[model samples]
Target chain A: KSQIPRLSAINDLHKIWPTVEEHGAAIIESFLSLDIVRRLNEEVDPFVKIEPIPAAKTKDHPNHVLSTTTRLVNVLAPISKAYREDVLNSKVLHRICSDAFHVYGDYWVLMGAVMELAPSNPAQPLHRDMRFSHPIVEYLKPDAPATSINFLVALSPFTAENGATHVILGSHKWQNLSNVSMDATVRALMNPGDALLITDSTIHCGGAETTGTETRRLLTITMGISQLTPLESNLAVPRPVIESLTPLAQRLLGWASQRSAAPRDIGLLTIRGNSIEKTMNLKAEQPL
Target chain B: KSQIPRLSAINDLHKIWPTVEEHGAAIIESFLSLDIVRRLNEEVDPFVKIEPIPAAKTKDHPNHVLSTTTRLVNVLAPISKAYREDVLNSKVLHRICSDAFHVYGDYWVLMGAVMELAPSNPAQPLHRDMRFSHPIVEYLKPDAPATSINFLVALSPFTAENGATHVILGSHKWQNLSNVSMDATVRALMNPGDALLITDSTIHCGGAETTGTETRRLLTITMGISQLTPLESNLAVPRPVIESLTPLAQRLLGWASQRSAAPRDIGLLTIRGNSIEKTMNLKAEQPL
Candidate 1:
């Protein structure tokens, strides 16, 4: 019943990078271990022990259509040992991400949050992820490489009746407004452990569940080039929490370093009173 | 007459930093040399040879009220040697920008654009500059240091009758929306060499001229922490242009380096095919 193309195995996932480059999104079946999905759901259950808070109205959700979608923040922290292990130690995840963005340099996790959409939750408005109103995306020519990328891992089976994420295939090629309809979109129907990779610029949203009582649970992990700021403040991460993770986890969590040094401008500056000196380190200069 | 508070001398400008921190904006009289302003205007005149194009409609200018205004991009290039000298080599400008944001951390120029508001131009809608719909300013934490700052250097005498920029005094301290009116704003009437410093979180706009034939000319320089992507892409800058700039100017123009590296995350991936590597240079980490 799924219209979105799916890669059957991790080995075949390498093809996804090129498709994403061409179409802005792709889906993969059984991308993670079922054990991992169950672990993540168990980890988040306690956080959702109380009644879920009603989603507030936003410009995009004027009628509070998403009021039934509950959120659990920072689900990837060390507290979720199994989930953190899957993310930080997964060679398959690394290889797929690397191949997907091979043209771009290395990548790191920006933030990871969990979403639980209850039955009757309305469809989310279509949008892109850059989210800046400054028309900066206009300058990002169509042929250029992507500036940001995202991944959504399904913790529960995603089906049309359960509000599978909907994506407009090849909409990334569009520059101006284009015609849109439910018939034109690809709904990513997948079982637990499946994942979807998408470019941040793609036009997409979560579809509404028309017939199902079960909640749709998803773990979203967003990563980008180092120069961009993480959506969540890594600075506020508790030191003890950082100490409990593997060095690799700590690095991906942004504990290993602040942003890299600039060519000649002042180095990274933070509100924490930490200062990196300004230098002309041209050999390592990463020009945009 | 200028209703905006003004500091009279460079030595006294340091005191203005606290004012900007408290109020989100402050003005300085006779900030730059008259010779510099005239030279910059002359250099930009050739670039704007024909009639300047009308400003486009924006959320902040829903009625296209700024249509009467014209713009000249990258006013700090070699064409304006004096202007570049002041920006790249001026210890004073650096000191002020640095001190004003010392609490925020090391900073880099986000973008530089010059505006020329013609007579009959109407007042612009009040707005903040972060330009992200998410209200990112809210996460910036009011008690925390400023996340971004801007400088508007006057190239012509700014007068109340000719649409000097208007700012709400201490609006940065505002937690909720307040009724806005011209009476509540402080008009920044200034001489050719004056400048205004403002936080990106401030509520302000370009005021309309009630009576005047002159166009208001201003050069705007915006800077923020290193982790943030610049508002403008320096990658598109011509190589020849880069070679013509002084080392300092090149750095400020972002030709010397791109945004800094990061831990495991990809550092500074632009839509262009440019990238920096990821490394764990913790000492160089610039956290927000």
Candidate 2:
């Protein structure tokens, strides 16, 4: 009964977006080149080798008191050039995000993080990404437009035996979480370069790993409608890392003050005022 | 030397907005009814009599380590009916805010706090409110549109002798802090029921209390474009307080999941999905 739709890297988003919307998720095979995926793993080696710290949990469970099998890397965008240009700057992914959040017409990167699930990890608790802020997300209509979406590019083979993520298809539409059960979830197995697109509204979690030996690596880049507060602060990006970003990446990571979908003026601003596009042209003059 | 334009509550915003925009501030005399202002003072009596706690200070000054002259009350919307209804829900204030922050068509409350500048208080540091997040705000072009604006309603007469706020008019256009000087500043002298509209970009601060005996009461309601993370969290509002709000109040205070001015999709959610209007109709059914 696991029928998550799959698309190749060059597949028509016009066609692929519907499957992601309908199922609340889709997998893009070979979404990244293997060499680039290898590069991310190498850059992240230091993070994984460290002791496991508790990652964020659902509100029902609350923060970092009862987890031991997860290691997460923050400030991910600058460390790996391959990930920044290829994944965060991917046009294919951005179009789908804009299409899904069509009302805003534009989107920006909310946060980028990497998590490696250690062996012996019981399935991390079941939760939605949007649960980081809203409590009633489980009650939202499934067809409601997403607030944010995640592009989880696999850094290693995701397997049911190795903590591939588990999700309930169409859960984004539930009137309530009354139907939630681990049994209904399908494991999101994928090759190293395959990436999963999951709306923030959908119910999903890190899969339970039975092997107790393998490490499952995942990199998630969250894209939100250009208008909301991000879960993680972009200002936390190191100065050097920000200096290395593409102009598009700079704007996406919140370096540039936002422009209006409606040209709605400055809820946020840069040194140059409301127009970041103008500000970017003279970065040397106004270095952040 | 003290020619702050005075407007009755019903004055033309077209005439008044530019005064506030170009000067970085303006005074709306008799902006509130004497009776409503009286009611607010009565409601906030409990907050003022308790020993003063430091309210938020600028990032350059940071949080309260060195304040004995100020007491602040937060979560204001639910506490005082006048503050929430006549003040937070004021049409005149909202219009001017929209005009100053012209990029975003709609705006939302950032935070509301009632502060009492007690006797013996030295002048607080001169800084912009946007500095709470952005460091280079001092370096922003003087002409940049505002990110947020403050509605400082005088619960009591604001006087230079009684520690009225000090501000540099036309400072909003400064290229940097090079021209900043307390000597160039003007005290916002206002009668009870008057209000001051100051964009977050402009430099201002609590005035020194020369009398060292009289108390200066003030209520500040900050508004920002509908897009960025608020300085204070709206989720902290009590359930009873939320239940008491006007639909508009609920939306402005962030209880309602936002709809698109541009119709951008969910960066926030409610049980009813993206449409908070639909959700608010039956509060009893989905009581927070």
Candidate 3:
């Protein structure tokens, strides 16, 4: 089996670009520092743990019910300090979105959250983020820009036995997934603080805890083209919390308006028929 | 200027079908009975009135701020009886969405709201409902399905002098709106109980209160393919309120689960990995 593209250095675009373009994914070593990971774990762990639903409740139905033992926190912007400072405002990720693996000119957050899998959690059905916008098994033109990208970093040690992510390499280049096989997929094993960067069109899933008591924790940060609708609307975040974040952070959450000189302008206040950033400043207030 | 297509009879698909397929819009006289109109007006008007904001505040911003006197209520399913029983479950509209417009298989609400334009309100710059989902000025294939549709029912008088609606006939068929002019548009004047059905790609906007003081009110009910994200999430309606709606009504608001058999399955509780209503019944709470 072909190994995943693993880079010891995060700065080498030459190595990173080729792997990402050809395989639709790459792994970055030391994506987060231990200090940041410690702070993040301290701030986030308590919220993710819950009394696991009993065996019968966690059992699968015809279409699949996510194991309650594997928990999900749809929001992180308001709850964690290191999450706000290190994850949402990651510069290396920003640079990758803007310059590396091609261009969308400008981008914004699609959805970001934390996912944890406890003992006996089953592997999720294979899915692509693009399915929400297009047909699940549709063809893509050779030169079209990817609709989105995701960066999943481990908050704890990720191993095959403990259920690291399962991904199909080069799934982006395929016409349809009608003939896909488990043999074609690989487990993305990583150490704590390492990251798996994958394109939106790639088929992947959260790996199952086949035989381990340990829980696997992952932080998935996804970004998309400016024109797309974000998966997570960020409606739960408070006004004060939004005001305190960095400028880039606020923009990613779509608090600021956007102005396009040509084509159509898009911004806040949907009823107001606004296209450009209507005010002198993008910041919020009562002056209007 | 070309006037909007007006039909004196609702049962004539021959008359209604040609207008909708050609001009991208049609109007039906006596679409709702006088009794229903009176009831709808009584239920909806009190909520739309507010002390007129100062003229300066209603004045134009760099973009436009909707006139403060013009009010909006984004929801109706919970408060209005005629809205729920008559409008949402209209046999005529259902027949049209299924048979006349010719195929999206099944559809649901995109966004439905109450819009009231008060005195001194300026004409809205022309816009398309499709802009939220696609480029404002882009071409659609002649064979492609209309991305969405709108059925606007007048609860109050809609006249040219008091501001009805400005629309460019056949605009949905045009390549782009770059050359569109106000002179090319016509006001879709109407009396209470009349309804105007328009396609998403058509260029139209709220007409202005240039010379009269009458407050014009309209109920806009829009629908799209089941695969698209609903513009109105129905998040405001309480659980008990939603539980009281008709079967079709609940489906329109996206409360029911979708099972596609062939492609992706989408539904409630994003974290639950539920595609096929997950646990037998689509109803919420209790017994997992």
Candidate 4:
């Protein structure tokens, strides 16, 4: 099943904004360990693979990709369970987004990355990640309808010297970027293990290796209204990993949660698809 | 003759960053005076007439009336003259924009009257401006190419109290809105006669009137490449007013530079429409 909903507009999408607030951008820390990244990068079999973004055709430099996953829609089961129960259900990230859109459920991986080597280049255009996934479609009601949130868990130390993501502050006031003063934006440098949360409305761009030959790494995740892409168990962990995970992590990966009982339900989730009724059933633990 | 080229998708657009830097965003301070605006708001006989922006069906509250003109394509000659030689143009609003696809030249008189009142009803949905003008079009390239630049000239003072326009700090990176922040963005406060420029890719929304309630007034102008929308003159300055324009303003409005008189190859210009070449061959102090 896809993690996106079959919707025409984000205006119809609904979810609670608590997670985005509690997390101040919907970020979960330590979803993956540096050891895992290190181990994965060196392994050749059953080894972790990354998506390779092609270089820009017109520009002299191509966007680089040290490490990133293709699509977590099929592989996020174990991760989701851990995130939902332990991170999301616990209301850690929910509080940050409390004033914003709800993460009705962990909708999509949006983007999964584990950077290892810094691309020898400058930061990519000052842009936002949301623009990479969903595109503007005709028959759209509002150019902006709160729909998604970004959650990035740092797997490695983010440093200014090594190249960190940068953003153009307050550039999102207009429907687009024509008016943004590039000089006003700055880089969001983070240490390894620090989380960065940004909304879909934020203007941001990726960093390039300006220093250090070693690599910079991070684990980026995206969340939005569950109606857009309800969570599933297929991407869940195996029976073994399930048993090892904490009870909360289990629920996050859709294990301990009572929301879904069959592999088919999770399989049916379409990114940006419908199923609001199912999404409505999800409940998070309220903070004391 | 048109002051700027028509707006279309087929033409290639480039930014005259120089013009923008030379002049602030709201370059039509002198043209959009309260007297002219008041008159347009009350009249219906001119080639162009101000119209009412119907109450917002979605966002928040009731709106105010700004000025609008009709059949604006006929006033290009005077506009060119004004750009090249207007006194007010020397103040804070002299700039130029080259022709581009889906947008031509630029909007000079940007007035911001209430689109929706503040303390808006909770029923309002967040939206961006481009959603209203461009609607949607199939992309010739895989990526959404830029087609227009929106210019908002605050006719009256824009304060947070008056429900100024909201903008997401980094929402432009979003391919679409839902993918950016799950949270709604904030409205920006501006001053009377200020300019807010936006591109085709930014994500923005309307703001709620947090407090103040003076009829929030603003103006919006836009420009893009030729071949999109017919180049029409939107302003209706009286003869005396038109005669008082500065040289810079006249040039930007498309006035004929007088450095050419003794034209050499008028035939070549007629055939190729290369005004630059034809003008260069003209005698000094003469029309090219």
Identify the leading candidate in terms of lDDT.
2
lDDT of each: 0.60, 0.66, 0.64, 0.36
Cα miss at B226, model 1 (Å)?
8.8
Highest DockQ, which number? 3
Off by over 4 Å in 4: A1-90, A97-99, A102-122, A136-145, A230-288, B1-288
Cα deviation at B101, candidate 2, in Å, is 22
| lDDT, candidate 2, B147-265, per-residue tens | 67888889998887998888888776665688888887888898888888788767888888899788999888778755554444444345667766677777677665443232223
Output DockQ, candidate 2: 0.05
Please write out the lDDT profile of model 3 over residues A121-151, one tens digit for every residue.
Answer: 8887787764533331133344455656888
Candidate 2 chain A, which ten residues in sequence have the lowest lDDT sum?
A57-66
Cα lDDT over the full model 3 = 0.64
Candidate 4 residue-wise lDDT, A1-288, digit = tens: 111111111222223233332222322343334454444334311222332333323312223321231211123333433333333343434443343432122232323333344445455556554332233221123334345566555545666676666655444343655766556556555544446666666666666676646455555555543222211112213455545554444333433212111211221111111121123232333321
Q: How far is A223's C-alpha from truth in model 3 (Å)?
A: 5.1
Model 1 lDDT on a 0 to 1 scale: 0.60
Higher-ranked by lDDT: 3 or 4 = 3
| Model 3 CA lDDT for position A20 | 74
Q: Residue-wise lDDT of candidate 2 within A147-242, one digit each (tens)?
A: 678888898999888889888899876667878889888878999989888888678888888897898888888787655654344443455666
For residue B284, model 4's alpha carbon misses the true position, in angstroms, by 78
Residue-level lDDT tens digits of model 1 in A31-54: 778988888788777765542443
Ranking by lDDT: 2, 3, 1, 4
DockQ by candidate, in order: 0.04, 0.05, 0.10, 0.01
